[PDB]
From a paper:
Glutathione transferases (GSTs) constitute a widespread superfamily of enzymes notably involved in xenobiotic detoxification and/or in specialized metabolism. PtGSTU19 and 20, two paralogs sharing more than 91% sequence identity (95% of sequence similarity), would have diverged from a common ancestor of P. trichocarpa and P. yatungensis species. These enzymes display the distinctive glutathione (GSH)-conjugation and peroxidase activities against model substrates. PtGSTU19 and U20 have the same secondary structures as the known GSTU structures and show the canonical cytosolic GST fold.
The crystal structures of PtGSTU19 and 20 were solved in their apo form (U19 APO and U20 APO ) and in complex with GSH (U19 GSH and U20 GSH ). In PtGSTU20APO, no signal was found in the electronic density map corresponding to the region between β2 and β3, which includes helix α2 and its upstream and downstream loops (residues Glu34 to Lys51). In contrast, this region is well defined in the final electron density map of PtGSTU20GSH and PtGSTU20GSPAP and adopts the same conformation as observed in known GSTU structures including PtGSTU19APO/GSH. This region contains the invariant Lys39 that stabilizes the C-terminal carboxylate group of glutathione. PtGSTU20 has a valine residue at the beginning of the β2 to β3 region and not a glutamic acid as the other known GSTU crystal structures. Indeed, this latter residue participates in the stabilization of the region between β2 and β3 even in the absence of glutathione (see earlier). When a significant structural change is observed, α2 helix most often undergoes the most prominent rearrangement, as in the case of PtGSTU20. In PtGSTU19 and 20, glutathione binding induces two distinct stabilizations, β2 to β3 region for PtGSTU20 and α6 helix for PtGSTU19. In U20APO/GSH/GS-PAP, this tryptophan residue is buried (accessible surface area (ASA) of 4 Å2), making the H-site quite deep. A cysteine residue replaces Tyr160 in PtGSTU20 (Cys160) and only the first conformation is present whatever the form (U20APO/GSH/GSP).
Author numbering:
A (entry chain A), B (entry chain A): 3 to 33, 52 to 217
Write the structure that this text describes.
């Protein structure tokens, strides 16, 4: 009834895995992607798939009920999706350019921390929502890119609240039981950086 | 109660003008933008503002009720928002490069025509929806960019159905009464092309 055409490394595919397990939806994971196929009908683009999952299985909501709060959630999701030019530079740049790219990524994450997260445990408050799911790539995927490139970005000293969020997110049992193996993910990131020089 | 911080040329600001007039919402237009301010609270990004307007004033819906149909509408909106690298080239490129950029824009519009519009009068069926509004920049703004650059993109011969859609959209009384003056818009596009060489 529900098929997920994805991969074992893509953070975009894992956003869908999380949202489906948060709704209790059974699916067959078939390893561009991701493409969710529900009753033979396909939905592409992880952000479009997430809103489809939220509307199709409304129990245990992953977006707030208030329209202003929903607009703020979509604003932060769009903000993360737009700021990908800074993250690409972590796979291409080397030396002094790489340290400038890492500082740019930190400034992007700082806006998210100050204006999006604030003092909440999660972007969704006391539990994860679609905003947390959309920023989940900043946990073990960003950690792997940092190690493969030799640069530090998400540190407790420079981003105290976002660093504490990233630990809390990765420790959520649903997330902990559904993430790539770090060793395999790091080797994948090293290979991607090698390809893009 | 509702303020719109915008401009007289931005197609992104006009998407908001249309959606507000389709809902019968009175507002003060104050001429980055657009920023809708509702009860002192600001919402930025035209696509985030459109979903906020649709949720806040649910009468005369601008999105379908079915989740699969809503996902398809959001997919096409995201598709138009992503394919902006082809449209930028119409302001920068010259000669043989400009004709190659115009053909790339045509291929982007052809996918939209075949898979998004099909045989419907509008992307929303018998009346305009948020998909039509999001593609409204392909009407008089694209016409102005074509004239300022000396290239043809949306022609009846190469895009028969999308060309007929663009005429139908621009003739909708709500749109006809709420678009920039073509002379002023063309002079703005000529100036933007001059700036970007
Ligand atoms: Ca870290
Ligand atoms: Ca034309």
């Amino acid at each position: 009834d529900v098929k997920l055409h994805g991969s074992w490394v893509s953070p975009f595919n894992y956003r869908v895995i999380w949202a489906l397990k948060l709704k209790g939806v059974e699916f067959e994971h078939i390893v561009k992607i991701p493409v969710l196929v529900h009753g033979g009908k396909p939905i592409a683009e992880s952000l479009v798939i997430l809103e489809y999952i939220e509307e199709t299985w409304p129990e245990n909501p992953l977006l707030p009920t208030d329209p202003y709060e929903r607009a703020m959630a979509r604003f932060w999701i769009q903000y993360g999706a737009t700021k990908t030019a800074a993250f690409g530079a972590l796979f291409r740049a080397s030396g002094e350019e790489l340290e400038k790219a890492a500082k740019e990524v930190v400034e992007v994450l700082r806006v998210l921390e100050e204006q999006g997260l604030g003092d909440k445990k999660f972007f969704g408050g006391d539990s994860i929502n679609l905003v947390d799911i959309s920023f989940g790539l900043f946990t073990c995927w960003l950690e792997a890119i940092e190690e493969a490139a030799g640069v530090k970005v998400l540190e407790p000293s420079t981003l105290p609240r976002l660093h504490a969020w990233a630990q809390n997110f990765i420790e959520v049992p649903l997330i902990k039981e559904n993430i790539p193996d770090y060793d395999k993910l790091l080797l994948h990131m090293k290979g991607v950086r090698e390809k893009m020089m």
